[PDB]
């Protein structure tokens, strides 16, 4: 009659999503670190190879560089490859680099995993990433492709946004959020110049990783993204 | 004798506040999106009509524009008008636009609600907002005026501040926080210029609204606040 | 054979850390305020007295100024000196200024406390801070030196970083996080200039301290850090 | 059959130079060989016949599906060929480090016999002694 409302049932998809979210919410205290990287060289580098990738049928995005930077951080700061179950003798350290890429789809939140990301080049990752993204979009993923990540990267940047506070998928200890790239005035040396900056948000499980360690891992990533040639070698 | 301490009882007001806060804290995983809007045109527009409002006995603030921008987002992204109770057949979608305005008072946190905000002009909202604010300040609100919101806006900006992390009032799915407006160097086109920026913080319930959707809703709001004429039409 | 994993026991140190963290995570809804202070004068002031401190065997850092600014805020906004236990007649107001300084060590998170911080000068604090830091690093702290804080300051800035989201040590109502200092373009008066900015992150317990109060306390701190002479007098 | 040819390496020289200091800080000596190793892996992948081997019986055409590259060295013990296994999964700095370690092991006779086996292809450097266009003997397998 007035202030109309429509009632709907949670059982179709919402209940399934909530069942997982209601566990993640009290898994651990979570801490997020908000920071920014200067990506001037990254932008220039990706641009330089954009045409080449196109000739090969590969679309470059910045994500493949982020994936490589994360693998490097995971190697330097090995605590990030750990996972924790609830029993006492359950601290697990992985010795491989499997990186999940989150995607928001009509089926909820899916996370395809690139296994052995440590052994792939940038063009190969770009191709695998694009293929997994399409499979996720259409619901064509094999369940075994959504398992085994040591860490996950969540892109919000494709929708715009900065500094969000991603939820750590509960079996892991950290998730890296990626925001948009946009020019901002920065001070470089003695001058105020504009340069593209990438908003980063790192979320970690406080029960295992402390503040200084997480920030150091983030600093590692920031340094590599700002200079792709060192990242590649 | 030394390191003196005074003991007081929680039962006067603190217990009542805590009773509500201790439920909200574990209602859902919450995600906040921190971002900024260029409000150069908004500032100029409000200024232009400041004298007119004064003649009519109306004080303009930026909030009436925020309220209109939120209504527009609520309409474009209808998931934001939903609410969830704990039983399975409890997903409720509202078909009206009732917006709560939070206020910090000596009686705790009050939220007067502007009903049918979708049918009001800017001057009318400014007048209603100011009246509700006074009623809240003095404790003169009728309980029915604090009910029925589809969404709430929390201003911290009147006290200064940026990017806070508002608590979603548990019956709803999102809350919009508003920070201060201040000039910052920005890069506009090819030049570094200063312009007033509004700090925004959007908090949403992860069990229903995903990252991309919340950011899109926020982008909608940012676009409208940056250009009030489109917002009005 | 493939995707190797190593299992380890949580009982050495991790269980102890988790036992505390798993309580703090659901103690209260926590709200963080992210903001920035212009510290141009602070930097210049510390520099001016750097040589003097060195002659006396004292290393100056910015922390002693932060400690004084916090004491001042604690005095102006006395709610910050409170603590809460879980029984009803447990609202405790302290009438002293004991400030904890957090440190990330190989023994987990330690918090030495400077008692009666309100009666110490900057050089004295710098000396006490450095001594406590060394004792914490080596595990030489007396347990009574880790007790009695009214508030805690957490530095992440020594590792780089901005805007983190510190966990309030559960017995208290607020924690102040300190990020790095770095120059950023700012607009000052009518010009775009660069100046060192300090990233601040204030985290508070929503059951006792509201948004406006916490922001006002933060504004107090920001004003004092931007002008050390007023802070000293 | 030998094919004698020449490559313009202006960019290669400039690139190695750029990262020389970095490698030194990490305890890594860069030479051009790590780039040659990567270029060879790429060729082996594009032209897979190069990963084959042949034994003398008829049903002995073997195609490898991995990239193990031998690096020949002339030592006082004769010609040794340490093998970098899974060269396809290593970065330049890592190869430079492995190459230098294998070279030292070969020089001192400290190689484990299993480190001299499994190559799909071998690279022979004569360049360290000067020289152009030599006619290397294909290790028969």
Author numbering:
A (entry chain A), B (entry chain A), C (entry chain A): 1 to 233
D (entry chain A): 31 to 171
Provide text from the study.
The HIV-1 envelope glycoprotein (Env) mediates cell entry and is the target of the host humoral immune response. Functional Env is a trimer of noncovalent gp120-gp41 heterodimers, which are generated from the proteolytic cleavage of a gp160 precursor. Uncleaved prefusion-optimized (UFO) design can stabilize diverse HIV-1 envelope glycoproteins (Envs).
Briefly, E2p forms a protein shell of 23.2 nm with a distance of 12.8 nm across the hollow interior measured at the inward-facing tip (G382). A 3-aa “ASG” linker, with “AS” resulting from the restriction site between the Env and NP genes, enabled the proper display of Env trimers on FR and E2p. The BG505 UFO trimers are attached to the E2p and I3-01v9 scaffolds using peptide linkers. Owing to conformational flexibility, the Env-corresponding signal (or density) was scattered in the 2D classes and initial 3D maps (top left). Consequently, we were unable to reconstruct high-resolution maps of full BG505 UFO trimer-presenting E2p-L4P and I3-01v9-L7P SApNPs. To overcome this problem, we applied a previously developed data processing method, in which two flexibly linked entities (i.e., the protein NP scaffold and Env trimer here) are analyzed independently. Although additional density at the core of the NP and along the five-fold axes was observed in the EM map, attempts to resolve their structures were unsuccessful.
